[PDB]
RNA sequence: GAAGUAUGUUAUUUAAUUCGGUGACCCACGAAAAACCUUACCACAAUUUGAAUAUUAAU
RNA sequence: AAAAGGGAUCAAGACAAGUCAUCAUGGCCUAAAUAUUGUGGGCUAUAGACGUGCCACAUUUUCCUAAACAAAGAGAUGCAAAAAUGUGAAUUUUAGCUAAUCUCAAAAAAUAGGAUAAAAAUAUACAAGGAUUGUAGUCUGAAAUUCGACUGCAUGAAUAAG
């Protein structure tokens, strides 16, 4: 079932359905930089070779 | 302020 | 201008107009008890005309920031106001490109 | 307002009788739906129409109507010249 | 997910058998039926409302006079058909004053 | 004096009575009471 | 496996019934509306935002509600020299009761005169959750304004 | 076959129990509006509010020495100073009437 | 297709009569609701780091 | 039961087809204005002309009376019964239901009777028709004048089936 749609849901009150599609962007948004997150050059004591 | 420069000051000593 | 935040407080399709119409419906949240109070009073014939008179002047100075005529519903992703489906908060056509992609829980191609 | 039991919809409007011969100037509104009252009779009156303020004196036939039904906003339309 | 699921019917289902109480019914003195609704989880507003009903002749202090008089003051609550006078309220915030209401008014009528 | 021949004047107060008739009374200030300066910008 | 009408307890159905688990439910309800406002979840974890319940917690000063006391210890952890009170203060617990429990309300009297303009607004505010008492407040303000402007 | 004046004894007695408006001459007391339930919070609610974003994903991080770049917003900068180097940035801000 | 009339458009008018579509494939089309709002147009008033982010200085 | 039916789907390519006014985007422009806020007006103008519908031009029509038969959909941004009031739009007041429960809600044509005819062209027999306008009201809403929707009374245009 959860391939059908991305949101596998069903609520009485549809307030809390209506803004789903928006936040899919949001998530996926924060969900893409999140796994891009890396140490700084100085943490790690790696020469950054500007540019 | 104004047009943005570049944070040379950057690095970290052994 | 007075009702627009000093801060941006829209985490959608922020526009010129959906601004506009956003604090539209602040206002008018905050003064609903206010101009229901108005409009009990003009439309209540048993308390005297001036009583009456007062209030019907009164309901004319507010902003019309203040008005729920003017709260109409736009998409949340385009900022249009033509077209718009209060179960989506979004116009047909962007209904139905996130029908087909699945991001509408529940909609589906129809055919009978 | 339309129905009779609401009353005449009443505008604030700078309305202050002058003095027995005192020079009054006239009263520019923009309130084109401010309804003539009896008390109007007498006044003259400069409604604005989008563009202009076109004048106005009240009298007693204008009792009941509405200050922009007496100032045109669009201009007659006439094939030629 | 069913292996999920599968596990709790088999190992923690059957410990709700523990604590599972058995049906009695109502005395003559339980004249009431209330309704109470739960959306289980969510809010909405119509899990205020509060129904009750009961029968005009459980009500046997009561005389034949009264009984008929009460059919009257309910007015459009009464059905005739059934003989049940239904009753709700979702006039308070919340359940447990809507509950009281009722209780209150069924005591005035 | 008064003399309304069109009868616009008896129509009003046959509808809304006779406070809004000038003399000398809801027209005391509530028309003029809150008619403010610089009411509305631009005139 | 473990299974107790304890650990069911805060999942259960809100009704306001003559069982008194149905009551303890609607007062659990109560806690969580105070506290934020998010569904009793016992199960996904302890794991919270700190900065974000010290800031509710201390500047702006509103309950707030742990779904177990492992929760609560996390928080304690994650934090430095932070101190939360063991339970809410008599008051509070009077007042979750006081309503939601017992349900205590303001019977709306019956007014006989319609020209009783105050009693009467009263009346029909009295008689819907519509109307919260600071929305009363602001049409009552306005109203007696308005009556008492109309007046010699 | 009831005599009306005696049927508004039973109607009345109704609204005193039930606590209703008793209003046998049908007379506009604007009562309707009282009734009516107000609409403002269930309006304002419509547009989302602004929520967490790459920012607070940043500063979220930050602490233990992580970093990401703001792809949206390092391009419209990249932009920005490309109009600038072949004279195509904006002009001067105005602070003062045309004069 | 002739009558009356709801409606879209041309042309013309207008301070503005917002814009686009405009052979088949425009013309009850975008528009699944123009008194305010919508609204993008005009007249008269009002505002100038503005509603966003960043940086540098003060509290 | 069966000789079933409909819906969705329907490629590449061309039309430099439509859309830079949903969104998104390169280049080029505006940056005290080609940006932003309110009041009023306009988008509703009207010589001629072109497209969509609605309805009418009576005899298989329309009008009057009565005790038949549907489906589907809507009501937490609300559907509103019964009663009472008004010629009417509608008002007063809320019972119930947030729903296979309660409400909108009543199907209409039909079927069966009944009334009207020189049913418009012979002016002492001017049919059907409901545009135009006057006037008195109702509802929504700060607000109904430009410019809203219905109701009562009066007014009674063209219209011979093109
Ligand atoms: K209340
Ligand atoms: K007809
Ligand atoms: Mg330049
Ligand atoms: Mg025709
Ligand atoms: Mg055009
Ligand atoms: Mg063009
Ligand atoms: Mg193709
Ligand atoms: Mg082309
Ligand atoms: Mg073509
Ligand atoms: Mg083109
Ligand atoms: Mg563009
Ligand atoms: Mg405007
Ligand atoms: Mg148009
Ligand atoms: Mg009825
Ligand atoms: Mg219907
Ligand atoms: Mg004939
Ligand atoms: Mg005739
Ligand atoms: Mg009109
Ligand atoms: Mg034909």
Redesign the pocket.
């Known amino acids: 079932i959860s391939k059908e749609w991305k949101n596998s849901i069903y609520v009485?009150?549809?307030?809390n359905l209506k803004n789903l599609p928006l936040f899919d962007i949001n998530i996926n948004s924060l969900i893409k930089d999140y796994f891009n997150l890396q140490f700084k050059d100085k943490i790690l004591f790696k020469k950054k070779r500007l540019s | 302020?104004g047009v943005?420069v570049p944070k040379r000051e950057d690095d970290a000593k052994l | 201008?007075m009702f627009?935040?000093?801060?941006?407080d829209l985490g959608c399709?922020?526009?010129?107009?959906v601004?506009?119409?956003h604090s539209?419906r602040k206002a008018f949240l905050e003064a609903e008890p206010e101009?229901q109070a108005l409009?009990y009073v003009?439309?209540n014939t048993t308390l005297p005309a001036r009583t009456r008179a007062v209030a019907?002047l009164q309901?004319?100075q507010?902003?019309?920031?203040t008005?729920?005529?003017?709260?109409?519903?736009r998409?949340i992703?385009?900022?249009?106001?033509?077209?718009?489906?209060?179960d989506f908060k979004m116009?047909?056509?962007?209904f139905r490109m996130n029908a087909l992609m699945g991001n509408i829980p529940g909609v589906k191609?129809?055919?009978? | 307002?339309?129905?009779?039991?609401?009353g005449p919809?009443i505008?604030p409007l700078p309305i202050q009788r002058p003095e027995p011969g005192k020079k009054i100037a006239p009263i520019r509104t923009?309130?084109?739906?401010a309804?003539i009252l009896p008390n109007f009779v007498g006044l003259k009156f400069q409604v604005?129409?989008?563009?202009?303020y076109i004048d106005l004196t009240v009298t007693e036939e204008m009792v009941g109507?509405?200050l922009?039904?007496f100032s045109?906003?669009?201009?007659?339309?006439?094939?030629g010249? | 997910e069913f292996r999920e699921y599968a596990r709790i019917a088999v190992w923690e289902m059957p410990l709700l058998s523990k604590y599972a109480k058995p049906f009695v019914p109502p005395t003559s003195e339980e004249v009431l039926r209330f309704?109470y609704?739960t959306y289980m989880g969510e809010f909405?507003?119509?899990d205020?409302?509060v129904?009750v009903e009961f029968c005009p002749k459980d009500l046997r202090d009561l005389s034949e006079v009264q009984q008929r008089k009460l059919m009257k003051l309910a007015?459009?609550?009464y059905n005739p058909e059934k003989d049940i006078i239904?009753?709700?309220?979702?006039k308070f915030e919340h359940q447990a004053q809507n509950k009281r209401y009722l209780g209150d008014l069924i005591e005035k009528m | 004096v008064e003399l309304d021949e069109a009868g616009k004047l008896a129509?009003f107060r046959?509808?809304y009575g006779r406070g809004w008739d000038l003399d000398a009374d809801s027209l005391t200030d509530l028309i003029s009471g809150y008619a403010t300066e610089n009411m509305?910008?631009?005139? | 496996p473990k299974l107790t009408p304890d650990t069911l307890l805060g999942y259960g159905p809100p009704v306001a019934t003559d069982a008194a688990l149905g009551k303890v439910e609607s007062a659990m309800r109560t806690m969580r509306i105070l506290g934020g406002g998010l569904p009793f979840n016992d199960q996904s974890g302890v794991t919270s935002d700190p900065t974000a319940i010290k800031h509710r917690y201390v500047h702006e000063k509103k309950p707030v509600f742990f779904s177990s006391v492992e929760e609560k210890e996390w928080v304690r952890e994650s934090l430095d020299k932070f101190a939360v009170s063991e339970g809410p203060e008599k008051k509070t617990k009077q007042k979750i009761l006081e309503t939601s429990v017992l349900g205590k309300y303001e019977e709306p009297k019956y007014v006989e005169s319609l020209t009783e303009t105050v009693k009467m607004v009263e009346k029909?505010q009295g008689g819907t959750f519509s109307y919260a008492p600071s929305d009363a407040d602001k049409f009552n303000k306005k109203l007696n304004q308005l009556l008492a402007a109309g007046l010699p | 076959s009831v005599p009306?004046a005696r049927?508004l004894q039973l109607?009345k007695a109704?609204?005193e129990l039930?606590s209703?408006?008793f209003?046998?001459?049908?007379?506009?007391?604007?009562?309707?509006i009282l009734?009516?339930?107000l609409?403002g919070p269930?309006?304002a609610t419509?547009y989302p509010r602004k929520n967490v974003g790459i920012?607070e994903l940043q500063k979220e991080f930050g602490t233990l020495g992580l970093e990401v770049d703001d792809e949206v917003?390092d391009?419209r900068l990249e932009?920005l100073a490309?109009?600038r180097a072949?004279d195509?940035?904006?002009?001067?801000?105005?602070?003062?009437?045309?004069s």
């Open positions: 009485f009150n549809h307030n | 302020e943005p | 201008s627009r935040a000093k801060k941006l399709f922020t526009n010129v107009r601004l506009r119409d539209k101009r409009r003009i439309r019907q309901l004319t507010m902003h019309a920031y008005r729920p005529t003017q709260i109409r519903n998409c992703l385009g900022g249009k106001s033509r077209g718009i489906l209060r116009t047909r056509y962007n191609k129809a055919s009978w | 307002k339309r129905s009779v039991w609401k919809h505008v923009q309130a084109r739906s309804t604005h129409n989008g563009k202009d109507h509405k922009g039904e045109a906003t669009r201009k007659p339309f006439i094939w010249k | 309704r609704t909405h507003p119509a205020r409302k129904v007015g459009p609550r239904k009753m709700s309220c979702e | 129509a046959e509808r509305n910008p631009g005139l | 029909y | 009306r049927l109607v109704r609204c039930f209703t408006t209003n046998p001459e049908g007379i506009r007391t604007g009562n309707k009734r009516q339930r609409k269930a309006l419509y920012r917003d391009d932009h490309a109009l072949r195509k940035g904006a002009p001067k801000k105005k602070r003062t009437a045309p």
